[PDB]
Tab-separated table of C-alpha atoms in Angstrom:
chain	number	residue	atom	x	y	z
Y	1	UNK	CA	13.894	-10.634	-16.884
Y	2	UNK	CA	16.848	-13.499	-16.691
Y	3	UNK	CA	20.186	-12.800	-15.397
Y	4	UNK	CA	23.172	-15.018	-14.335
Y	5	UNK	CA	24.167	-15.085	-10.959
Y	6	UNK	CA	26.707	-12.453	-9.831
Y	7	UNK	CA	25.155	-10.005	-12.687
Y	8	UNK	CA	23.134	-7.043	-11.309
Y	9	UNK	CA	19.315	-5.689	-11.996
Y	10	UNK	CA	17.732	-2.754	-11.582
Y	11	UNK	CA	13.759	-2.863	-11.359
Y	12	UNK	CA	12.216	0.020	-12.375
Y	13	UNK	CA	9.055	1.981	-10.226
Y	14	UNK	CA	7.004	3.533	-13.575
Y	15	UNK	CA	4.281	4.855	-10.884
Y	16	UNK	CA	4.088	8.661	-11.277
Y	17	UNK	CA	4.392	10.526	-7.875
Y	18	UNK	CA	3.060	13.980	-7.474
Y	19	UNK	CA	2.606	14.403	-4.235
Y	20	UNK	CA	5.154	16.002	-1.683
Y	21	UNK	CA	4.673	13.239	0.597
Y	22	UNK	CA	4.429	9.562	-0.669
Y	23	UNK	CA	5.780	5.997	0.626
Y	24	UNK	CA	6.969	3.325	-1.706
Y	25	UNK	CA	6.850	-0.284	-0.958
Y	26	UNK	CA	9.321	-2.713	-2.779
Y	27	UNK	CA	7.445	-6.283	-3.056
Y	28	UNK	CA	8.738	-9.924	-4.268
Y	29	UNK	CA	6.143	-12.462	-4.519
Y	30	UNK	CA	4.021	-10.078	-2.480
Y	31	UNK	CA	5.574	-9.444	0.350
Y	32	UNK	CA	7.308	-6.162	1.183
Y	33	UNK	CA	11.221	-5.975	0.834
Y	34	UNK	CA	11.408	-2.547	1.503
Y	35	UNK	CA	9.668	0.793	2.422
Y	36	UNK	CA	10.357	3.872	2.408
Y	37	UNK	CA	8.952	7.757	3.660
Y	38	UNK	CA	9.474	10.752	1.319
Y	39	UNK	CA	12.538	12.160	2.832
Y	40	UNK	CA	13.611	9.773	4.960
Y	41	UNK	CA	15.531	6.166	4.179
Y	42	UNK	CA	15.030	3.223	2.912
Y	43	UNK	CA	14.814	-0.029	4.963
Y	44	UNK	CA	14.707	-3.555	3.413
Y	45	UNK	CA	13.041	-6.278	4.597
Y	46	UNK	CA	12.449	-10.116	4.716
Y	47	UNK	CA	14.504	-11.572	1.734
Y	48	UNK	CA	16.216	-8.321	1.197
Y	49	UNK	CA	17.105	-7.426	4.917
Y	50	UNK	CA	21.154	-8.078	5.458
Y	51	UNK	CA	21.333	-7.849	2.135
Y	52	UNK	CA	25.107	-5.705	1.423
Y	53	UNK	CA	24.168	-6.017	-2.500
Y	54	UNK	CA	21.018	-4.065	-2.346
Y	55	UNK	CA	20.153	-0.039	-3.123
Y	56	UNK	CA	17.484	2.094	-3.374
Y	57	UNK	CA	18.185	4.242	-6.113
Y	58	UNK	CA	17.180	8.095	-6.477
Y	59	UNK	CA	14.537	7.575	-4.068
Y	60	UNK	CA	12.593	5.341	-6.590
Y	61	UNK	CA	14.299	2.056	-8.497
Y	62	UNK	CA	15.445	-1.103	-6.496
Y	63	UNK	CA	19.050	-2.458	-7.559
Y	64	UNK	CA	20.619	-5.742	-6.928
Y	65	UNK	CA	23.982	-5.438	-7.736
Y	66	UNK	CA	24.824	-9.269	-6.511
Y	67	UNK	CA	22.137	-11.450	-7.995
Y	68	UNK	CA	21.537	-14.707	-6.509
Y	69	UNK	CA	19.219	-18.008	-7.380
Y	70	UNK	CA	16.992	-17.106	-4.420
Y	71	UNK	CA	16.661	-13.359	-6.014
Y	72	UNK	CA	14.213	-15.224	-8.228
Y	73	UNK	CA	10.656	-14.068	-8.269
Y	74	UNK	CA	7.840	-11.304	-9.256
Y	75	UNK	CA	8.954	-7.497	-8.680
Y	76	UNK	CA	7.300	-4.185	-8.148
Y	77	UNK	CA	6.562	-1.416	-6.505
Y	78	UNK	CA	3.382	0.044	-4.792
Y	79	UNK	CA	3.139	3.803	-4.052
Y	80	UNK	CA	1.250	5.538	-2.173
Y	81	UNK	CA	0.779	9.205	-1.998
Y	82	UNK	CA	-0.362	11.392	1.589
Y	83	UNK	CA	-2.689	14.409	1.155
Y	84	UNK	CA	-5.807	15.359	-0.328
Y	85	UNK	CA	-6.225	13.807	-3.667
Y	86	UNK	CA	-3.567	11.567	-2.508
Y	87	UNK	CA	-3.645	8.621	-4.865
Y	88	UNK	CA	-2.177	5.097	-4.830
Y	89	UNK	CA	-0.901	2.329	-7.237
Y	90	UNK	CA	1.279	-0.402	-8.230
Y	91	UNK	CA	4.302	-0.325	-10.934
Y	92	UNK	CA	4.615	-2.385	-13.482
Y	93	UNK	CA	5.245	-6.043	-12.760
Y	94	UNK	CA	8.567	-7.970	-13.518
Y	95	UNK	CA	9.081	-11.757	-13.819
Y	96	UNK	CA	13.250	-12.317	-12.538
Y	97	UNK	CA	14.609	-15.773	-13.634
Y	98	UNK	CA	18.179	-15.997	-12.292
Y	99	UNK	CA	20.126	-19.103	-13.839
Y	100	UNK	CA	23.751	-20.592	-12.558
H	1	UNK	CA	-23.439	-5.991	5.792
H	2	UNK	CA	-26.584	-5.107	4.154
H	3	UNK	CA	-27.901	-1.928	4.753
H	4	UNK	CA	-31.632	0.662	3.720
H	5	UNK	CA	-29.950	4.135	2.745
H	6	UNK	CA	-29.796	6.265	6.000
H	7	UNK	CA	-28.451	3.969	8.356
H	8	UNK	CA	-24.737	3.909	9.486
H	9	UNK	CA	-21.871	1.530	9.445
H	10	UNK	CA	-18.114	1.443	11.176
H	11	UNK	CA	-15.917	-0.696	8.708
H	12	UNK	CA	-12.887	-2.050	11.025
H	13	UNK	CA	-9.083	-2.134	10.295
H	14	UNK	CA	-8.094	-5.470	11.830
H	15	UNK	CA	-4.330	-5.197	10.982
H	16	UNK	CA	-2.261	-4.664	14.015
H	17	UNK	CA	-0.290	-1.897	14.217
H	18	UNK	CA	2.529	-1.721	16.389
H	19	UNK	CA	5.325	0.479	14.324
H	20	UNK	CA	5.586	4.199	15.523
H	21	UNK	CA	5.192	5.604	11.846
H	22	UNK	CA	2.558	3.762	9.375
H	23	UNK	CA	0.285	4.438	6.577
H	24	UNK	CA	-3.017	3.708	6.690
H	25	UNK	CA	-5.357	3.786	3.465
H	26	UNK	CA	-8.882	2.176	2.894
H	27	UNK	CA	-10.064	0.684	-0.249
H	28	UNK	CA	-13.511	1.200	-1.775
H	29	UNK	CA	-13.333	-1.716	-4.775
H	30	UNK	CA	-10.027	-1.815	-4.945
H	31	UNK	CA	-9.265	2.244	-5.516
H	32	UNK	CA	-8.427	4.282	-2.215
H	33	UNK	CA	-10.815	6.414	-0.280
H	34	UNK	CA	-8.554	8.052	1.893
H	35	UNK	CA	-5.566	8.078	3.287
H	36	UNK	CA	-3.315	8.721	6.209
H	37	UNK	CA	-0.017	8.711	7.754
H	38	UNK	CA	0.541	8.770	11.678
H	39	UNK	CA	0.494	12.162	13.002
H	40	UNK	CA	-1.168	13.437	10.144
H	41	UNK	CA	-4.711	13.793	9.490
H	42	UNK	CA	-6.880	11.745	7.368
H	43	UNK	CA	-7.470	12.584	3.574
H	44	UNK	CA	-10.550	11.556	2.033
H	45	UNK	CA	-10.219	11.015	-1.448
H	46	UNK	CA	-12.920	9.947	-4.904
H	47	UNK	CA	-16.293	8.893	-3.776
H	48	UNK	CA	-15.508	9.836	-0.012
H	49	UNK	CA	-14.084	13.422	-1.160
H	50	UNK	CA	-16.762	16.143	0.142
H	51	UNK	CA	-18.327	13.795	2.502
H	52	UNK	CA	-19.376	15.479	5.876
H	53	UNK	CA	-20.789	11.969	6.718
H	54	UNK	CA	-17.781	9.945	6.744
H	55	UNK	CA	-14.750	10.335	9.888
H	56	UNK	CA	-12.077	8.509	10.416
H	57	UNK	CA	-12.316	6.569	13.956
H	58	UNK	CA	-9.350	6.645	16.860
H	59	UNK	CA	-7.229	6.646	13.950
H	60	UNK	CA	-8.173	3.440	12.324
H	61	UNK	CA	-11.329	2.590	11.401
H	62	UNK	CA	-13.832	4.461	8.611
H	63	UNK	CA	-17.317	5.457	9.795
H	64	UNK	CA	-19.820	6.277	6.596
H	65	UNK	CA	-22.613	8.037	8.923
H	66	UNK	CA	-25.809	8.645	6.285
H	67	UNK	CA	-25.367	5.155	3.887
H	68	UNK	CA	-26.391	5.876	0.311
H	69	UNK	CA	-27.068	3.393	-2.437
H	70	UNK	CA	-23.648	4.373	-4.277
H	71	UNK	CA	-21.422	3.632	-0.838
H	72	UNK	CA	-22.215	-0.062	-1.915
H	73	UNK	CA	-19.171	-1.981	-2.471
H	74	UNK	CA	-16.089	-3.906	-0.908
H	75	UNK	CA	-13.817	-2.165	1.408
H	76	UNK	CA	-10.575	-2.752	3.837
H	77	UNK	CA	-7.508	-0.979	5.186
H	78	UNK	CA	-4.076	-1.306	3.767
H	79	UNK	CA	-1.672	-0.787	6.702
H	80	UNK	CA	2.267	0.243	5.629
H	81	UNK	CA	4.807	-0.013	8.434
H	82	UNK	CA	7.891	2.458	7.873
H	83	UNK	CA	11.390	1.561	9.259
H	84	UNK	CA	13.238	-1.461	10.270
H	85	UNK	CA	11.579	-4.619	10.319
H	86	UNK	CA	8.293	-2.887	8.555
H	87	UNK	CA	5.477	-5.023	7.816
H	88	UNK	CA	2.694	-4.253	5.417
H	89	UNK	CA	-0.949	-6.163	4.868
H	90	UNK	CA	-4.672	-5.969	4.271
H	91	UNK	CA	-7.068	-6.083	7.206
H	92	UNK	CA	-10.229	-7.962	6.232
H	93	UNK	CA	-12.664	-7.438	3.504
H	94	UNK	CA	-15.695	-6.242	4.355
H	95	UNK	CA	-18.871	-6.516	1.292
H	96	UNK	CA	-21.596	-3.687	1.802
H	97	UNK	CA	-25.183	-3.498	0.412
H	98	UNK	CA	-27.077	-0.590	0.353
H	99	UNK	CA	-30.788	-0.320	-0.658
H	100	UNK	CA	-33.391	2.188	-1.066
């Protein structure tokens, strides 16, 4: 995915969630930039901390409304299901390129 | 770790957990064999499903009391912290050989 700074991007988590209770994290270059427990609220961390232009969309997807060059990197979601037969996995990885 | 079948082994999750709300998973060869949400109960899955000799110890460690040859593989814990500044990471990877 390639964009100019100031554009927006929505990153899609394409991992199936069937459990009633589950956790979602968004990762940037292998570091968690957001965590969420089902029924709770998103907590943005590391590079996405203090960012007013980031949103957790439909309790799943990651929106960066005001892309910076520093937002460049690899992004993916990780899901952990809680309970019997609970599964765990990663969504598709996306390489974000941002130009001036 | 190299053990004869019938021996026991305790796998240690050495990830520091300071957060109040968190999730612990144990992985075997990259596949989750147990999940746990703080305040909840462990759920054993995949190869550890329906094992009466497996236990979640002191709310973090993995005990297999009656090792089978099929139990061999690589094990590690993953922790996800929930909330502001929440981190996530893996414990040390352990390699288990079980022989007849």
